[PDB]
Design a binder for this molecule. Structure first.
Ligand SMILES: N[C@@H](CCC(=O)N[C@@H](CS)C(=O)NCC(=O)O)C(=O)O
Ligand SMILES: N[C@@H](CCC(=O)N[C@@H](CS)C(=O)NCC(=O)O)C(=O)O
Lengths: 208, 209
């Protein structure tokens, strides 16, 4: 069915795992240890030399956001029509931009750059608060009336930022309630409480 | 429509979508934002992520360069023939964006001290696109499938700006080299790429390239 090939971290696979779990899908995790990675054969076979790698039947994919968009397209989590699909992309690309900055903080400048990052964070979260504000009072999903792949990515994004800077959502009522509502979904709640999520580090260097 | 492109007077993250629009017979308005106007702050505060490009398609306002490309990709028939092709198109675009991200960081934050090592690492960054071409009809067509996609325009722009940064960087990659020559020769795109329009804008906003 579906196969996720990645290191034993949440990282760039947390959102697509949340998606698969919440949509009732089954998948196989193939965990790559770092000692297997430094051997070099798997990395050499990876299109961009990186993980994650994903299998959907006989279709092999790389890029975390390609995986999300593919699941969105094939499972119907991409909006109701081309205009909503564009808005879904606009949210996901915004999520990706902040994740990229988060990853840079974690791996290359945590100690010295955290203060600084945290101070900039409210300005980085407000666009998502604004998007919720413009969609049914923030009472449903980031775009439209149904969940999309961007909701799962946004949710992961918010969760890891709550760990980095607890209380960071206190200034954003719609985002705070949105985290609460999505996290309470029955399948996602079960997954987020499970050892396969809880006992993985967010990032590869233990920093969070 | 015409569409509207709101951007600084730079090629930057609008080069690919403009090439797409020009090659696909579309009409659009360029609303150029000067430094003076941007720094006044009204427009910026009105942008969803505080940044440009902003794109108008009728009543639909979009931000994010890659959202604009995907929107034009799906509405103009440049996203592959089926769901499989669409996923491969995304995989290419995401790889383009990753390397564009590294290019922009070099240009704006570390150009003088970092350009040397960036060009040294560049063959490793181009090889995946050569590999993708080798697996699609011997590199003789497009990056995905046998019709042009929005990822072709983004990859072409990425390759072109890298040829400015490091001339001859594609000489070691015969399929990418032929691909660039082939796409650049598509007559409407060729006319656009030789136009004032394109030629008279700097690649980046800080004068480095
Ligand atoms: N843009 C890619 C980035 C993938 C990426 O950064 N992978 C890292 C782990 S999160 C990796 O494989 N590092 C090992 C290496 O580059 O050698 C995506 O979203 O999947
Ligand atoms: N991820 C965004 C990045 C947009 C971006 O970086 N915009 C820059 C120009 S390329 C900008 O607006 N700088 C002005 C500012 O941030 O105030 C996209 O792809 O559109």
């Amino acid at each position: 069915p579906y196969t996720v090939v990645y290191f034993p971290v949440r990282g760039r696979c947390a959102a697509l795992r949340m998606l698969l779990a919440d949509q009732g899908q089954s998948w196989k995790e193939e965990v790559v240890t770092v000692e297997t990675w430094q051997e070099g054969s798997l990395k050499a076979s990876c299109l961009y030399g990186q993980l994650p790698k994903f299998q959907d039947g006989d279709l092999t994919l790389y890029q975390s956001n390609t995986i999300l968009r593919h699941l969105g397209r094939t499972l119907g989590l991409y909006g109701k029509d081309q205009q909503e699909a564009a808005l879904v992309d606009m949210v996901n690309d915004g999520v990706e931009d902040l994740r990229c900055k988060y990853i840079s903080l974690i791996y290359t400048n945590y100690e010295a750059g955290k203060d600084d990052y945290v101070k900039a964070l409210p300005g980085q979260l407000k666009p998502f608060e604004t998007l919720l504000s413009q969609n049914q009072g923030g009472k449903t999903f980031i775009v439209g009336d149904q969940i999309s792949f961007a909701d799962y990515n946004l949710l992961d994004l918010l969760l890891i930022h709550e760990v980095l800077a607890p209380g960071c959502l206190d200034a954003f009522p719609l985002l705070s309630a949105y985290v609460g509502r999505l996290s309470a979904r029955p399948k996602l709640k079960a997954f987020l409480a499970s050892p396969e999520y809880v006992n993985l580090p967010i990032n590869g260097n233990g920093k969070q």
